[PDB]
């Protein structure tokens, strides 16, 4: 039984996130980067700022195109995975690509491309979510104009109770999994950038889920800020001194 006396297997309460660790600017050859741990998830995102899209036919004359690639290392799962995309990888890449299309100021770079690469070194429930949070930090880290930051977490449902950031056992036996992504401006949830759901929920449980989700998103949002600022305090001072 997943929930016992108000507690989940891992031991946390219905409204608690798993341990998170975030680190910005970890790759030297990428324009922007971020290492992120969300539970047993270990992901790394890299970004290659506005560059020349050479396959000329895919070149938009009025704005930049956004490309996002989600990929699992053959050694990130319990059972070795054959390298290469699958229908799932392709769908995750697409919905993630759209989440940033809605936030990036693409009009600023006609004929160019902004490629976002995300690799999950070790997977658990929510890698999709782990990846979005890392991409957001990586995009900021590269200095590409955005309307704000994107934060993502998922809500699940076990033993008929909504839970925040579901673990594997919960996603495999629960009654629903619902990953969300929000655009956050100045510490406030503005709108949603990604919404997906599989399961069985009542109209009333969906609304509650949005609320539970919003609460977790803001928490992750403060960790994204801390990671970035921490990493940028020094250059900021340098620039302030020089300027």
């Amino acid at each position: 039984k997943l929930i016992v006396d108000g507690l989940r297997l891992d031991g946390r309460k219905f409204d608690e996130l798993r341990p998170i660790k975030i680190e910005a600017s970890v790759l030297k050859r990428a324009d922007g980067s971020c290492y992120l741990e969300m539970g047993k998830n270990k992901v790394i995102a890299a970004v290659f700022g506005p560059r020349e899209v050479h396959p000329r036919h895919l070149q938009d004359p009025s704005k930049a195109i956004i490309r996002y690639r989600y990929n699992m290392a053959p050694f990130s799962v319990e059972e070795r995975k054959r390298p290469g995309p699958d229908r799932r990888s392709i769908e995750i890449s697409k919905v993630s690509k759209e989440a940033f299309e809605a936030v990036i100021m693409k009009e600023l770079f006609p004929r160019s491309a902004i490629d976002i690469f995300v690799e999950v070194l070790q997977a658990d429930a929510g890698s999709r979510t782990a990846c979005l949070n890392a991409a957001s930090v990586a995009l900021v880290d590269a200095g590409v104009p955005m309307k704000g930051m994107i934060t993502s977490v998922a809500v699940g449902k076990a033993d008929g109770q909504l839970v925040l950031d579901p673990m594997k056992e919960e996603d495999n036996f629960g009654e629903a999994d619902m990953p969300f992504a929000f655009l956050i401006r100045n510490g406030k949830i503005e709108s949603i950038a990604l919404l997906q759901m599989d399961g069985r929920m009542t109209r009333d449980e969906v609304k509650q889920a949005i609320e539970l989700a919003k609460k977790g998103a803001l928490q992750i949002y403060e960790m994204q800020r801390e990671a970035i600022l921490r990493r940028y305090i020094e250059v900021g001072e340098e620039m302030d001194e020089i300027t």
Partner: protein
């Protein structure tokens, strides 16, 4: 690149400001729906659906096979779609695109998450043989919202599927026992306004939608936001209920 999109896009947006849809229908009303089952006699199951001038056919084929090494107690359902180049001038001739794959996944999620087909009831040999259900979606005319037309068609096809037992000397034929009725409602989101059941011309504004799938008891069973846009939480609250109400009306046609 352009043909008539911007002109039509300007027109669609133009009338939107007056809160009217170019065909004059309401923001919560679907186009006329026709469900015609049993059209491909050589298939275990089959159905053609007309959603306005949009058309799609779904075929259900079944053959025994081996189950996945993690669910030996379960039969298998594989959903795939072909958005053939014959459906529209934009459809590229070749392997499945991102769109073909996504339309199939949604159709596949509503059937599976609402558990319309009891997969445990399709086992032949614990970890050796189980029935394999192939649901193949084939677009014929793309005039908007192939997703919904496909979902309705898929479930209508299952409900008319006949298990080919005798053909494999595994028993006597019987109707695929369908226990639920998933239905999806797709809306076009333009700013802080939504259009239920968008058309090809309305789609000229951009591929920005929200799809909600319900089961027979009015529970949400699958949701999917698509396209690069921001969704206002208050529009979602409204569309959620509107969507549950539209799914309910559509679920009546199956009677």
């Amino acid at each position: 690149e352009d043909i008539l999109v911007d002109i039509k896009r300007d027109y669609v947006l133009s009338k939107l400001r007056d809160n009217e849809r170019i065909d004059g229908r309401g923001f919560d009303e679907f186009r006329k729906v026709e469900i015609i089952p049993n059209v491909i006699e050589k298939a275990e199951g089959s159905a053609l659906v007309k959603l306005g001038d949009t058309q799609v056919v779904v075929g259900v084929k079944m053959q025994p096979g081996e189950p996945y090494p993690d669910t030996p107690d379960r039969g298998v359902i594989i959903v795939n779609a072909e958005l053939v180049p014959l459906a529209s001038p934009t459809f590229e001739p070749g392997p499945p695109d991102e769109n073909s794959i996504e339309l199939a996944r949604v159709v596949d999620r509503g059937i599976r998450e609402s558990e319309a087909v009891d997969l445990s009831k399709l086992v032949i040999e614990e970890g050796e043989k189980v029935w394999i259900v192939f649901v193949d979606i084939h677009a014929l005319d793309d005039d908007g919202n192939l997703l919904d037309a496909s979902a309705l068609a898929a479930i209508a096809a299952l409900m008319n599927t006949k298990v080919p037992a005798e053909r494999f000397d595994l028993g006597e034929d019987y109707l695929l026992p369908v226990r639920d009725l998933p239905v999806s409602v797709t809306s076009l989101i333009v700013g802080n306004k939504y259009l239920v059941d968008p058309s090809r011309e309305e789609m000229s504004v951009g591929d920005t939608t929200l799809t909600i799938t319900t089961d027979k008891d009015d529970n949400v069973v699958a949701m999917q936001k698509s396209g690069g846009y921001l969704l206002d939480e208050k529009l979602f609250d409204e569309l959620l209920d509107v969507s549950i109400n539209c799914a309910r009306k559509l679920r009546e046609k199956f009677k």
